[PDB]
Amino acid sequence: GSHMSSITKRLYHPKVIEHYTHPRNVGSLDKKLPNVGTGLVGAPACGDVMRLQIKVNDSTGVIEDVKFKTFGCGSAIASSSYMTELVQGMTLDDAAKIKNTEIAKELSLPPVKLHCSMLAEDAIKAAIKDYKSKRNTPTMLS
Amino acid sequence: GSHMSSITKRLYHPKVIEHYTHPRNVGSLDKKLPNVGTGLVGAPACGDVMRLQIKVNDSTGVIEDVKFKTFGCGSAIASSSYMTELVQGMTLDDAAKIKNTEIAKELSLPPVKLHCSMLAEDAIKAAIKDYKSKRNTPTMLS
Amino acid sequence: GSHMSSITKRLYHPKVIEHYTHPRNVGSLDKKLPNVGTGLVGAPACGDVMRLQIKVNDSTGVIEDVKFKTFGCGSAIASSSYMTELVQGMTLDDAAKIKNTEIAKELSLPPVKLHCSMLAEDAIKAAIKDYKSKRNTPTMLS
Amino acid sequence: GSHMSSITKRLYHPKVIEHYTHPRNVGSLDKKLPNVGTGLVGAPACGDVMRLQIKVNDSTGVIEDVKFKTFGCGSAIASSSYMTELVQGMTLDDAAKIKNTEIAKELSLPPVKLHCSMLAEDAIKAAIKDYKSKRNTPTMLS
Amino acid sequence: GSHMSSITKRLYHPKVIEHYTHPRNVGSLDKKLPNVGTGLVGAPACGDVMRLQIKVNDSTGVIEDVKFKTFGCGSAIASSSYMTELVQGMTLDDAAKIKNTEIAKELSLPPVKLHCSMLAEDAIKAAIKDYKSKRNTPTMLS
Amino acid sequence: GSHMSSITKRLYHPKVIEHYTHPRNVGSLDKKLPNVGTGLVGAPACGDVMRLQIKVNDSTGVIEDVKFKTFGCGSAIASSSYMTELVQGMTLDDAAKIKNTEIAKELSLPPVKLHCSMLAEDAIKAAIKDYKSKRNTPTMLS
Amino acid sequence: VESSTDGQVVPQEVLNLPLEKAHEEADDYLDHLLDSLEELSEAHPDCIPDVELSHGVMTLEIPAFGTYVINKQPPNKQIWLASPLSGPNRFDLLNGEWVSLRNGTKLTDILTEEVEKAISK
Amino acid sequence: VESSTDGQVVPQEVLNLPLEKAHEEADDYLDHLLDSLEELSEAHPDCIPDVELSHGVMTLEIPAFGTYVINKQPPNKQIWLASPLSGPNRFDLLNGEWVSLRNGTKLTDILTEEVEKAISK
Amino acid sequence: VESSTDGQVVPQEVLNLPLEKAHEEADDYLDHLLDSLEELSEAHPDCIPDVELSHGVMTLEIPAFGTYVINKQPPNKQIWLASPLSGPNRFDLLNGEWVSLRNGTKLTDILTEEVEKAISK
Amino acid sequence: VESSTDGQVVPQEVLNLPLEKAHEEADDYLDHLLDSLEELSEAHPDCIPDVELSHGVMTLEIPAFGTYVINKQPPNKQIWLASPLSGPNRFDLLNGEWVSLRNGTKLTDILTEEVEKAISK
Amino acid sequence: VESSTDGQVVPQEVLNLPLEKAHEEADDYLDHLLDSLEELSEAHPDCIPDVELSHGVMTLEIPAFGTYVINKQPPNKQIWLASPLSGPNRFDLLNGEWVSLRNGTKLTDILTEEVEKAISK
Amino acid sequence: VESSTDGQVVPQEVLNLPLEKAHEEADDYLDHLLDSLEELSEAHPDCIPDVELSHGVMTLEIPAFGTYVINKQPPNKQIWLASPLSGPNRFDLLNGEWVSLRNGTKLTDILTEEVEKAISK
């Protein structure tokens, strides 16, 4: 991808960071209040917190919806978008074995070395693990 | 494996650290002033700090003397002592060669799965490499 | 096998230092104040000369700087540029084992020992051997 | 085997030894006078003593000059002489090869074994090791 | 290995020959006056001395009696004792059983090396060789 | 090793250079008057020139006569002489066409070089190749 | 008991402390090599064919700016880096990284360089 | 920090949070077994007299009590367990670690428990 | 100075100046290594309760710290030391004694440390 | 110039005198062939994804111009070049380069025509 | 000019500059060794009675001091050249030449030496 | 002083004390025979022009009276002997050197005498 956009234009204006968060000012700022209990991953030293939240139809095993949070680089937004599209309409099988290559490929030809480029891989992995736990099956998880 | 004797032994009453501070405790304590610029390593996650200062005859490449600082556990002092005794009168290469099972053998019976019992390997490697670097050869550091 | 770009246009870039000076030619020119003191190579059969001046941390081993003088083909200048870039910010060992089919590939084609286009291999090797004397070891020099 | 030739007479009484030292006899004689901190070897039973003083260019590792003292056997005078001629203008490495060959040939009628007649084996080993110490690369000495 | 004891006990206080000799020190004492010849070996560098005196029944080639002197290490007294006991009543050449090998084990546990505080090896070899000379057999002596 | 003389004594007086130059110096001399267009060679900064002039019986390529000029070392004359003897009365191919070895043996102890004291290989190659081109056979030449 | 041998033991603060980068003695390098192999192939402007590994053999593919193979050579003169233009140069392990007995030190720097000279032009 | 994959790349604070170990490259099994083996080696001062590594083949001397030897079988289900303690078992991967095909549980768990059950009394 | 040669020849001193350790060339080293271990151990059966030395393999049973085993590595980088300390360490000659292809450490000296640390604790 | 005659020794001439050059046979001819091949290759009309000379067997994947494959024939007119546009030929020395005994021309020349036409259009 | 670089090009000022001793591979070393042998042969009416080059053998004969003849030595290190006085020491590549893994001693020079000591005494 | 098995301990007077002829093994004897040949070879004007030690075949050359070679006999009365005068003989042991069953025969003395007669006359 020549342009994800990497820069992210127009009227963002510094990444999707600002656009998402908010609340402005308010002097009571902090992440609150609902959460669905799905996977969350974030490094404060890397400045990006990613959260993929799946919904899963138990009966067909199909990922009904999956929506994302992207923080950090604006390059990452496009990867997150495209992955969630693919994953929806696709079974649990697809939503597992999470790449790795997928994140790398979207941005450019895969470098085969990605240090804190995206935590998106981790976010979704946490999410499906959580799903398996709650429905009871930690032996398919291990 | 037998008692060295271990931690809070003897007549200190608790370990090396308390006895030789100056100032105790005091929660504002500082270590000053001369240092020799040799290796420094410390993991406060594992609660230990070690500083080995070698003195080296650069003619024969033999350790004239080596003294230690041990912060960690009272049992750890015994390992630092035994090594410094051994290492003196032997070559720079000989001074190292510490790892896992050896550190464990010194401290009692090895589990050989140990996680950060001691820093001594990092400390000594640093000290001998530092000497060679000051000598103006950096080929043996790498 | 792509443009440098150094298509010998307009007359600005062939050949860098020579073009800057002021006076030209003048057939009694000497390069001064700057001197070599490290790698020197030149083949005045085709009128190409290269002079690399390295600076090397004694303790770190890291190549702080290298400067390339090229009095040769316009295409050749790029080969030097890319190599000096690469070597800087990377250790001593990077400088070491430089062939001779890195620089040649960079110009366009890999053949070893180009006739009047690659003096850059010879230059770097000379410079680092010179440094080995100043390192104060003759063991690895031979 | 061939003649040096050495008269080994008269009033010495035995061999070269008297000419070098000076004061003669005197039964209170001392080892004197120039020294450069290089090797000294002597066996008390074979009556031989050798002192090789090297001068070494530290910019190439080349033996500039080497002068000798020989006390003892007539063959040993030739051993010192021929090796010292050869070694100059040649590196450290060359000196060690030349001395080893020189000891085995000089005694003549090769019985394989070591000899005390020429002390040159011990004397060069001391010199090259001493050189490394002063050159400050003791790690590669050992 | 076990306690003789090497030092002091049982009321020697040094060695086992000093406790019968008298004259002490005296710095003018010697081995005098009748002797059986046999193996004798004095090490002045290691400072230990051992003297095995065999008596031999000529007809059957059997050791009637064998006594020892041990000077030096306290550990060596035990090796000498046990060997001299054993070899009596057995054919001498077969009986001795010594390369090295066995002497080292007796001392404490073998270093699998010649200790240099054991001279019993040179002593026994000499002794059995001496017996063959007197018995007038040169065929199996060499 | 032999002397032809290789100093080419006497009243020449320095080598075969002054023998044919004659006139001395003169700094205006030229090779005159006729020429046959055969091989000529000369290597400046070796201080030698050789010109072999062949006559060839056009049947099987037998050399009817060949006379030479040698300028250079006295030793150098010997290759031109000896080679011209061989090729006369026989075909060129079976008495020529040897490079390094022919030159090496003839000068004295083999250098294992054909450069540049004796030019004789290059001199013959030029002459016989030129001949062959005119002959109109050049598909077994090149 | 604790966690977990051999790399694992460190506090994870060892990425600025001096420790062995990784020894072999026959297992580590082949895995490391594979990771490196994939990495070098990709991100070039010119076409790079797919690297194919057939067991006991390995081809590294680079664009038509020259290409070398990486193979093991049996005991003595191990792991020849047969370059078509420069010939083979042999390396015997010497300091936890393969060091040529015909040159300076470290194998990895050669691979890095020649590949990035190709990515460039 | 950058390079290569996968353990090396992480920022070292996503460790606690779910990650994938990965084969890296498939030698993997030997390394994991070695880790387990080291735990077994010591923590008993009265048992486990010798652990032998004889390159590819692997002997583990264990004192009076049923003795088992485990080593890597050449690919055909690549672990063999020799045991007159509960008889043979065979293992295949089910989630990137070996799971018993006749107990339904990883090999490492059996070893840990069985050796340390002795250390107890 | 005469016989046996090159050792056991003296003009009333064994040495007075250093002498580089020779090869001579395969067997000598194996004898030296085995000797070093045994020498260090001696007068104590606590450190190592028993040793068995077969032809071509050395076992040292210790249940008091685990076990390292010594065996000969196949041609090139000869001698193999397997130690649970850092895993197997491979050595090649570089000074007329076997020097580690990790940092450069003689095996002889590693044996020094490990045996006497056992006698200690 | 001292060593090594005569391809590394010059008194500044012999590059203007007629004397035979090259030949090893095996290494020198291939090396020269490669130099010529790569030099000719530049400014190709369509990208060349690779040329690999693996071990005296060469695959040259060129979708731009001729798809000749050069290999080494076993003893009997050693070397093989097959040119897909004028067929197979085999070459043996006659002038100090491999020369066709089916034409009377060198393999070096075949590369010249077919490659350099590609640069044109 | 062109070809073949750096010994064949004519500026004649690129030959006094430092450059690696060989670039391919074990051939150059052997050539240098033979070259020394030819050089050595003259100036002896006896002390060299012929040098013979045979497949997998080199004979330098010296009957005026006795001699040994060398042959290939199996992998690990190849070919000892160290004369009786210090016993056999095998030789391995270390940087552009075969250097014994003890000292700076190189094999070609040891043969050079023994022959010119003969002229001496 | 310390080291080694046996009689290698030098108190500076072990050279006048009796000690066993070999401590390792059969090779010692062979080394002595070779050593003697090296000493003998100098001081022959044409009597010995050749001595090459091959791979267990040793040639002694006397062109002026004829000669024979000595070699190892396959297992069963190991080491061959040759003479034209007294015919061939073979060996066993009686000191670990060789036997003297018929009739006082040692290849060290046989060679010694015959070569040194040449130095004489």
SS3 track for chain I: CCCCCCCCCCCCCCCCCCCCCCCCCCHHHHHHHHHHHHHHHCCCCCCCCEEEEECCEEEEECCCCCCCEEECCCCCCCCEEECCCCCCEEEEECCCCEEECCCCCEHHHHHHHHHHHHHHC
Q: Cα–Cα distance between E92 and E90 in angstroms, integer? A: 6
Q: Name which of I12, I15, I20 is nearest D44 (Cβ-Cβ).
A: I12
For residue B100, list chain I residues with Cβ-Cβ distance below 8 A: 84-86
Kindly tell me the number of DSSP H helices and DSSP E strands found in chain J.
2, 6
C125 → chain G, closest CA residue = G104
Taking an 8 Å cut-off on Cβ atoms, the answer to whether C92 and B139 are in contact is: yes
Closest CA to J80 of J53, J100, J103: J100
To which H or E segment does residue C51 belong?
strand C48-56
E116 → chain L, closest CA residue = L2
Q: Tell me the angle at which helices F77-87 and F120-135 cross, rounded to the nearest 10 degrees.
A: 40
CB burial string H100-110: b at 16+ within 10 A, e below: beeeeebbbeb
Size of interface G-I (CB pairs under 8 A): 40
Q: Name which of B43, B113, B141 is nearest G3 (Cβ-Cβ).
A: B113
Structure tokens at E79: 């090796």
Structure tokens at D90: 């040649």
Q: Cα–Cα distance between B141 and G92 in angstroms, integer? A: 19
What is the sign, positive or negative, of the torsion defined by CA atoms of J1, K95, C121, C113?
A: positive
For chain H, list the contacting chains (3+ Cβ pairs, <8 Å).
Answer: A, B, G, I
For residue I3, list chain D residues with Cβ-Cβ distance below 8 A: 113
DSSP tag of F74:
G
What does the CA dihedral H83, H87, H93, H94 come to, rounded to 10 degrees? Answer: -140
Q: Is K90 helix (H, G, I), strand (E, B) or coil?
A: strand
Give the distance from residue C49's alpha carbon to the nearest chain J alpha carbon, in angstroms: 19
Taking an 8 Å cut-off on Cβ atoms, the answer to whether I19 and D142 are in contact is: no
Structure tokens at A86: 């693919």
DSSP tag of B88:
T
For chain G, list the contacting chains (3+ Cβ pairs, <8 Å).
Answer: A, B, C, H, I, J, K
Q: Name which of H38, H52, H63 is nearest I59 (Cβ-Cβ).
A: H52
Q: Cα–Cα distance between L57 and E89 in angstroms, integer? A: 48
Query: Among residues D49, D63, D107, D116, which one is catalytic?
Result: D116
What does the CA dihedral F95, F98, F104, F107 come to, rounded to 10 degrees? Answer: 40
Closest CA to I65 of I10, I113, I16: I113
- Whether chain B lies against chain H with 3 or more Cβ pairs closer than 8 A is yes
Taking an 8 Å cut-off on Cβ atoms, the answer to whether K65 and L42 are in contact is: yes
Judged by a CB distance cut-off of 8 A, whether residue G63 touches chain K is no
Judged by a CB distance cut-off of 8 A, whether residue H113 touches chain G is no
Structure tokens at D31: 């080892």
Q: Is B77 helix (H, G, I), strand (E, B) or coil?
A: helix
Q: Cα–Cα distance between B5 and B12 in angstroms, integer? A: 13
CB burial string A9-43: b at 16+ within 10 A, e below: eeeeeebbbeeeeeeeeeeeeeeeeeeeebbbbbb
Q: Cα–Cα distance between F119 and F105 in angstroms, integer? A: 14
Pairing of strands L70-71, L57-58: antiparallel
Closest CA to F62 of F123, F141, F131, F137: F131
Q: Cα–Cα distance between G117 and G44 in angstroms, integer? A: 10
What does the CA dihedral H21, H26, H30, H33 come to, rounded to 10 degrees? Answer: 40
Q: Cα–Cα distance between D68 and A39 in angstroms, integer? A: 82
Best mutation target, K33, K42, K116, K119, to test chain F (most F CBs within 10 A): K42
A109 → chain G, closest CA residue = G43
Which positions ≥6 away from D100 have C-beta within 8 Å? D121, K83, K85, K86, K105, K110
Kindly tell me the number of DSSP H helices and DSSP E strands found in chain B.
5, 3
Give the distance from residue G11's alpha carbon to the nearest chain K alpha carbon, in angstroms: 38
For residue F109, list chain K residues with Cβ-Cβ distance below 8 A: 39, 41-43
Q: Cα–Cα distance between D103 and D112 in angstroms, integer? A: 10
Judged by a CB distance cut-off of 8 A, whether residue K17 touches chain J is no
Structure tokens at K21: 């001793």
For residue L10, list chain I residues with Cβ-Cβ distance below 8 A: 8, 10, 14
* Count of CB atoms situated within 10 Å of the CB of E31: 10
Find tokens 């002091």 and name the residue: E8
Looking at the DSSP bridge assignments, the partners of residue L86 are none
Query: Among residues F69, F116, F125, F129, which one is catalytic?
Result: F116
Closest CA to D128 of K65, I17, L50: I17
Q: Name which of I67, I80, I88 is nearest H50 (Cβ-Cβ).
A: I67
D91 → chain C, closest CA residue = C142
Taking an 8 Å cut-off on Cβ atoms, the answer to whether K6 and C140 are in contact is: no
Give the distance from residue G47's alpha carbon to the nearest chain I alpha carbon, in angstroms: 38
Pair C82, G117: CB distance under 8 Å: yes
Judged by a CB distance cut-off of 8 A, whether residue J50 touches chain G is yes
- How many Å is the maximal CA-CA distance in chain A? 48
Q: Cα–Cα distance between C92 and G95 in angstroms, integer? A: 15
Q: Which phi and psi angles does F94 have, rounded to 5°?
A: -100, 20
K75 → chain G, closest CA residue = G76
Q: Cα–Cα distance between E112 and I42 in angstroms, integer? A: 9
Taking an 8 Å cut-off on Cβ atoms, the answer to whether G36 and H5 are in contact is: no
Q: Using CB atoms and an 8 Å cut-off, which of residues 57-116 of chain C contact chain B?
A: 57-61, 91-93
- Note the residue count of chain I: 121
The alpha carbons of chain L give a radius of gyration, in whole angstroms, of 17
Give the distance from residue K117's alpha carbon to the nearest chain G alpha carbon, in angstroms: 31
DSSP tag of F75:
G
Q: Cα–Cα distance between K45 and K118 in angstroms, integer? A: 11
Judged by a CB distance cut-off of 8 A, whether residue E62 touches chain L is no
Give the distance from residue D142's alpha carbon to the nearest chain B alpha carbon, in angstroms: 8
Pair A37, A130: CB distance under 8 Å: yes
Q: Cα–Cα distance between F97 and F107 in angstroms, integer? A: 17
Judged by a CB distance cut-off of 8 A, whether residue K70 touches chain I is no
Size of interface D-L (CB pairs under 8 A): 17
Please give the angle made by the CA atoms of H13, H17 and H20, to the nearest 5 degrees. 105
Instruction: Determine if the peptide bond prior to E23 is cis (ω within 30°).
Output: yes
Q: Cα–Cα distance between J110 and L97 in angstroms, integer? A: 71
Q: Cα–Cα distance between G17 and F39 in angstroms, integer? A: 72
Closest CA to E127 of E78, E56, E69: E56
CB burial string F9-36: b at 16+ within 10 A, e below: eeebeebbbebeeeeeeeeeeeeeeeee
Structure tokens at E38: 């046999």
Size of interface C-K (CB pairs under 8 A): 44
Which positions ≥6 away from L119 have C-beta within 8 Å? L40, L43, L44, L47
- How many Å is the maximal CA-CA distance in chain G? 54
Q: Name which of B1, B109, B112 is nearest H39 (Cβ-Cβ).
A: B112
Please give the angle made by the CA atoms of D96, D97 and D100, to the nearest 5 degrees. 85
Question: Could you tell me if residue G65 is left (phi over 0), alpha (psi between -120 and 50 degrees) or otherwise beta?
Answer: alpha
Q: Which phi and psi angles does E47 have, rounded to 5°?
A: 80, 0
Task: Tell me the residue type at B116.
Answer: C
Pair H10, H23: CB distance under 8 Å: no
Judged by a CB distance cut-off of 8 A, whether residue G15 touches chain H is yes
Q: Cα–Cα distance between C73 and C8 in angstroms, integer? A: 9
To which H or E segment does residue A85 belong?
helix A76-87
Give the distance from residue L110's alpha carbon to the nearest chain K alpha carbon, in angstroms: 18
* Count of CB atoms situated within 10 Å of the CB of J7: 15
Judged by a CB distance cut-off of 8 A, whether residue K102 touches chain I is yes
Taking an 8 Å cut-off on Cβ atoms, the answer to whether B101 and I65 are in contact is: yes
Known active-site residue D73: no
Structure tokens at K116: 């010119």
Alpha helices by DSSP H, listed for G1-121, are: 28-41, 108-120
Q: Is F86 helix (H, G, I), strand (E, B) or coil?
A: helix
Q: Is J36 helix (H, G, I), strand (E, B) or coil?
A: helix
Question: Could you tell me if residue J45 is left (phi over 0), alpha (psi between -120 and 50 degrees) or otherwise beta?
Answer: alpha
For residue H1, list chain G residues with Cβ-Cβ distance below 8 A: 15
Give the distance from residue G54's alpha carbon to the nearest chain K alpha carbon, in angstroms: 27
- The catalytic site residues of A sit at 46, 116
Looking at the DSSP bridge assignments, the partners of residue F23 are none
Structure tokens at H36: 């387990």
Q: Cα–Cα distance between E8 and E2 in angstroms, integer? A: 15
